[PDB]
Amino acid sequence: MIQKVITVNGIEQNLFVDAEALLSDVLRQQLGLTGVKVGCEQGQCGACSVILDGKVVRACVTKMKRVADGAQITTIEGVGQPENLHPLQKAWVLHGGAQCGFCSPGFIVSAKGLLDTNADPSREDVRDWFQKHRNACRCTGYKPLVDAVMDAAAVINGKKPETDLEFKMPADGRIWGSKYPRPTAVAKVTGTLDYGADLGLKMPAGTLHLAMVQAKVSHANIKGIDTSEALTMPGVHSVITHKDVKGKNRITGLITFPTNKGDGWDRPILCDEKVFQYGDCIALVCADSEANARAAAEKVKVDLEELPAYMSGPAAAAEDAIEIHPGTPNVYFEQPIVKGEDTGPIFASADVTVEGDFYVGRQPHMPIEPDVAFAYMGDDGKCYIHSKSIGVHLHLYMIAPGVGLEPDQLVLVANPMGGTFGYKFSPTSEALVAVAAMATGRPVHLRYNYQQQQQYTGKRSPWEMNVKFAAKKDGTLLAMESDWLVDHGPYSEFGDLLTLRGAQFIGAGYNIPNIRGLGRTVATNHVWGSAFRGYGAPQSMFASECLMDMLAEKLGMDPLELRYKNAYRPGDTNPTGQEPEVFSLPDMIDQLRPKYQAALEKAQKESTATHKKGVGISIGVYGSGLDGPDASEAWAELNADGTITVHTAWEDHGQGADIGCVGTAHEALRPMGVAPEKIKFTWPNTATTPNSGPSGGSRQQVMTGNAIRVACENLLKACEKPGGGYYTYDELKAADKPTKITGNWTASGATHCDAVTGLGKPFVVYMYGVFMAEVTVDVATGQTTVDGMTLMADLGSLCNQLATDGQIYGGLAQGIGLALSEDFEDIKKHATLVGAGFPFIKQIPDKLDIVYVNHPRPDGPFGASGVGELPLTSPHAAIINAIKSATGVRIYRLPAYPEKVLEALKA
Numbered sequence: 001m002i003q004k005v006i007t008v009n010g011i012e013q014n015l016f017v018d019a020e021a022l023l024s025d026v027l028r029q030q031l032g033l034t035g036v037k038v039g040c041e042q043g044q045c046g047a048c049s050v051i052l053d054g055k056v057v058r059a060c061v062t063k064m065k066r067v068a069d070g071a072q073i074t075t076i077e078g079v080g081q082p083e084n085l086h087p088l089q090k091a092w093v094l095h096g097g098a099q100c101g102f103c104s105p106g107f108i109v110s111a112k113g114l115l116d117t118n119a120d121p122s123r124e125d126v127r128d129w130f131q132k133h134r135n136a137c138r139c140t141g142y143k144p145l146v147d148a149v150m151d152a153a154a155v156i157n158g159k160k161p162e163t164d165l166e167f168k169m170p171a172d173g174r175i176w177g178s179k180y181p182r183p184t185a186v187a188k189v190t191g192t193l194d195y196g197a198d199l200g201l202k203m204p205a206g207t208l209h210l211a212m213v214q215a216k217v218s219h220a221n222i223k224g225i226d227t228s229e230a231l232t233m234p235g236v237h238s239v240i241t242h243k244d245v246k247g248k249n250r251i252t253g254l255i256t257f258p259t260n261k262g263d264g265w266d267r268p269i270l271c272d273e274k275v276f277q278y279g280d281c282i283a284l285v286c287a288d289s290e291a292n293a294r295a296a297a298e299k300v301k302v303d304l305e306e307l308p309a310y311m312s313g314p315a316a317a318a319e320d321a322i323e324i325h326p327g328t329p330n331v332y333f334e335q336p337i338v339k340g341e342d343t344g345p346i347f348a349s350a351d352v353t354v355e356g357d358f359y360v361g362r363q364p365h366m367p368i369e370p371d372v373a374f375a376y377m378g379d380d381g382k383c384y385i386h387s388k389s390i391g392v393h394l395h396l397y398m399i400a401p402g403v404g405l406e407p408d409q410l411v412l413v414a415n416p417m418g419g420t421f422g423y424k425f426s427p428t429s430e431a432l433v434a435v436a437a438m439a440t441g442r443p444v445h446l447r448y449n450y451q452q453q454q455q456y457t458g459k460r461s462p463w464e465m466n467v468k469f470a471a472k473k474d475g476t477l478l479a480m481e482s483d484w485l486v487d488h489g490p491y492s493e494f495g496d497l498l499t500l501r502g503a504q505f506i507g508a509g510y511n512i513p514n515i516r517g518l519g520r521t522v523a524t525n526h527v528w529g530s531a532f533r534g535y536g537a538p539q540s541m542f543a544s545e546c547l548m549d550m551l552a553e554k555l556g557m558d559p560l561e562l563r564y565k566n567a568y569r570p571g572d573t574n575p576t577g578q579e580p581e582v583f584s585l586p587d588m589i590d591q592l593r594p595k596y597q598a599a600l601e602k603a604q605k606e607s608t609a610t611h612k613k614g615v616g617i618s619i620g621v622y623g624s625g626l627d628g629p630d631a632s633e634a635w636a637e638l639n640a641d642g643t644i645t646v647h648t649a650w651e652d653h654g655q656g657a658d659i660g661c662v663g664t665a666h667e668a669l670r671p672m673g674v675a676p677e678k679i680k681f682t683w684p685n686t687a688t689t690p691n692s693g694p695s696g697g698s699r700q701q702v703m704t705g706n707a708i709r710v711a712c713e714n715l716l717k718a719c720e721k722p723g724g725g726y727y728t729y730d731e732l733k734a735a736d737k738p739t740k741i742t743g744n745w746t747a748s749g750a751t752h753c754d755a756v757t758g759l760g761k762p763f764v765v766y767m768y769g770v771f772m773a774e775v776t777v778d779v780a781t782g783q784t785t786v787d788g789m790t791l792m793a794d795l796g797s798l799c800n801q802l803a804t805d806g807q808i809y810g811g812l813a814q815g816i817g818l819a820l821s822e823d824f825e826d827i828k829k830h831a832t833l834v835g836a837g838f839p840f841i842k843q844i845p846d847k848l849d850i851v852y853v854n855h856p857r858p859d860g861p862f863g864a865s866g867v868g869e870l871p872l873t874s875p876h877a878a879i880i881n882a883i884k885s886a887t888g889v890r891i892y893r894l895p896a897y898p899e900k901v902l903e904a905l906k907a
């Protein structure tokens with residue numbers, strides 16, 4: 001041990017540390033400075049950036065021996081605090097740079113180090129600095145961060161007043177449609193929002209820390225578990241196995257389709273009979289610390305009989321393949337799409353046909369915050385789970401039978417969380433922590449490291465796809481055929497639903513009267529499928545949007561013009577035979593057309609013989625909702641101090657549940673003149689908030705927004721005085737009148753798609769957009785640079801522009817990664833941020849352009865649609881179409897790795 005006297009955030013600290021300790025652990029655990037966030041633990045993400053003697057360093061790779069006696073350290077807590085924000089923190093809030101917030105301390109400290117060395121940086125200087133310091137963001141697309149740094153610099157420089165960093169009310173008081181900051185932003189930019197790992201550090205002594213004993217093979221029969229040596233290790237309390245589970249020890253997919261061949265109870269909580277994928281949790285070590293639990297977990301001995309693993313859909317779907325789930329075929333679900341007339345003869349006589357085979361792979365979500373959860377037995381005897389769930393009621397019902405509890409005996413709560421992008425539509429760690437809390441009676445806390453986040457949370461399911469079009473010479477589409485194979489890994493939850501998405505979205509955007517297609521879901525031993533932002537559309541529309549450009553190429557038509565010819569117009573129907581609710585694609589195409597022409601001209605002009613520039617187009621469509629007559633509920637309550645609490649279970653991945661609630665409620669409450677700061681939101685809790693539904697399917701602004709609107713209208717009626725005016729709280733209470741008022745809303749016009757034909761009206765609100773990608777391909781290295789992205793977006797009406805801008809930038813950035821670099825195919829090679837192709841700032845162009853072309857939706861609140869998944873529906877098709885424009889070659893199987901682009905160039 002060594003004594004080190006240093007200064008931290010301006011205050012002398014008398015530190016007693018191990019020389020080998022990591023500064024991240026010392027600051028977080030010894031000094032309680034949980035604003036130093038830890039994500040990757042490998043020096044790759046910058047979340048733990050601190051200033052050490054004038055240099056920005058990552059604390060997670062900085063050992064205490066490198067910290068000199070007398071050193072100066074600055075963490076986010078020393079940059080500023082909630083009622084003393086630094087200009088960078090104020091700019092962050094104004095510019096909406098904290099979405100999930102997990103990266104915000106690291107970027108803001110890093111940016112102070114920049115400004116302390118370069119007072120007046122160029123935007124390029126800012127991007128170069130965040131690239132060298134590895135400041136990673138998965139939510140924002142970086143542009144808002146760079147905007148915030150530039151604004152703060154100008155203030156620090158005396159160029160502009162600091163008060164220009166404070167939001168100015170539009171004067172009229174409307175915050176719907178405005179840039180009003182989100183309520184959680186100040187906590188995020190000051191590091192005072194506790195995420196699950198932070199809460200772990202602030203739990204009482206007595207809390208047990210868990211570590212997973214995981215399969216190190218992809219497929220096996222389990223013969224036995226030997227915990228003997230592990231029990232003798234430092235700090236170890238016990239080891240939990242399937243023997244300790246009090247229910248079925250299985251998670252249910254809950255809405256498994258009747259024509260699924262599987263019963264949806266395939267996924268174990270703790271493996272008992274078999275290993276189904278690498279990473280499967282077979283036991284939990286309970287210990288006094290994460291480090292002690294992990295050291296003992298390595299000593300638990302699992303005796304396995306390894307089985308041949310099927311690591312792709314085609315392998316597992318082979319007619320011969322052995323059943324992964326004995327008794328159930330590996331191909332366990334099929335969804336036909338049957339619209340119009342038989343396609344065979346239409347293909348036979350059409351002027352032009354085109355066909356392609358496409359692939360979109362196992363994209364990893366890569367939130368900066370790895371999965372974390374905790375559980376405890378409440379004084380009331382219920383088991384409480386606090387996790388990254390974005391569907392607390394959904395997960396309650398998916399895990400209660402397996403852990404052996406009735407829905408009245410378990411409570412799920414969503415912690416503040418650092419991003420999920422869909423992976424948390426699945427249970428990950430919740431059943432694990434509940435079993436351990438139940439078995440021990442003690443609080444338990446489980447943190448995944450980043451390798452566990454990559455290998456042992458769910459993934460975008462790969463799809464192998466064949467799509468064909470038939471068309472007339474004038475480009476009018478006549479018919480489509482489609483085939484898709486969905487590799488869902490071993491656990492069936494929502495796999496059949498994802499396969500149905502291919503019937504709804506392959507070919508979406510155009511009138512296509514005649515369709516014949518079939519999707520197939522296959523169990524494999526690769527990572528199980530969890531939703532990933534877009535859920536079926538990134539696969540489906542990559543195929544159809546690339547194919548539209550192949551059809552345009554073949555007809556000698558401009559691809560944008562071919563889309564204009566076919567885009568939805570009154571009278572048309574979508575692939576499931578439903579009429580669109582608004583018709584904005586021609587309008588967006590018309591407004592994009594000159595920008596596209598200018599872009600084509602720039603490309604042609606600025607291409608060189610080795611750096612070829614190109615421009616590519618795509619359309620995106622996705623539903624806002626769960627299929628069918630989805631619904632939500634909210635409660636609007638006048639409190640005794642005159643504030644109003646809007647109670648919902650709107651789960652916040654980081655997309656903006658707080659501002660969606662406040663902005664929607666503010667607009668609904670305008671007749672009573674309620675200031676936005678007087679409106680309170682509730683964190684999701686299955687015991688004390690209503691079943692608003694999960695934050696999946698870009699649904700909450702529509703479904704929960706409408707329920708908030710109705711609850712608020714109902715609260716206005718409850719408060720109205722006859723003759724005009726409103727009663728106060730005190731008045732209603734003296735009157736014995738109610739002050740907490742319910743509202744509900746249902747998408748009553750929707751119907752489920754048919755199991756035999758795929759036809760129906762699954763959503764009553766859709767999102768529509770048009771993408772333009774501008775790229776440069778180095779034809780010596782095959783490296784693609786995305787130089788600009790444009791999204792024409794119809795979101796109906798914006799609840800909050802900071803929120804929708806940031807949603808679109810973040811989605812476009814994930815589309816650049818899906819297009820060029822991201823996959824989870826090799827269990828080892830892809831288990832880090834950099835190995836899996838995470839996009840750092842220089843991979844995302846500063847030019848991210850949005851044009852809103854908003855057609856108010858008949859059934860959305862104040863006309864709004866969702867936004868969440870629109871930007872990831874097909875940006876990667878626009879990018880691959882731009883590589884084809886630049887170079888003449890087509891990448892059919894993502895990602896477009898440089899070697900793959902070179903092989904196509906040289907073919």
Ligand code: PCD
Pocket residue numbers: 099100139419420421422423425531532533534535653654655656657658659660661694695696697698699700701702795796797798799800801803804807810864865866867868869
């Ligand atoms: N018009 C409009 C729309 C919308 N908004 C906004 O925006 C957001 C979003 O919304 P939406 O769309 O409704 O959505 P939500 O439901 O809430 O959420 C969900 C999503 O969200 C997104 N985004 C995001 N972001 C962030 N930051 N993070 C994350 O993680 C995430 N995730 C992702 C996903 S994947 Mo799935 O599950 O796959 O289906 S689906 C999803 C919010 O805040 C709201 O409010 C506005 O403002 N306006």
Ligand code: FES
Pocket residue numbers: 037038039040041042043044045046047048049058059060061
């Ligand atoms: S760089 Fe330190 S936690 Fe990622």
Ligand code: FES
Pocket residue numbers: 097098099100101102103104136137138139140368418419654
């Ligand atoms: S706000 Fe940057 S990772 Fe979420």
Ligand SMILES: [Cl-]
Pocket residue numbers: 459460461498530531532533534535536
């Ligand atoms: Cl998906």
Ligand SMILES: [Cl-]
Pocket residue numbers: 890891892893894
């Ligand atoms: Cl290819």
Ligand SMILES: [Cl-]
Pocket residue numbers: 897898899900
């Ligand atoms: Cl490569």
Ligand SMILES: [Mg+2]
Pocket residue numbers: 511
């Ligand atoms: Mg027509």
Ligand SMILES: [Mg+2]
Pocket residue numbers: 899903
């Ligand atoms: Mg090669």
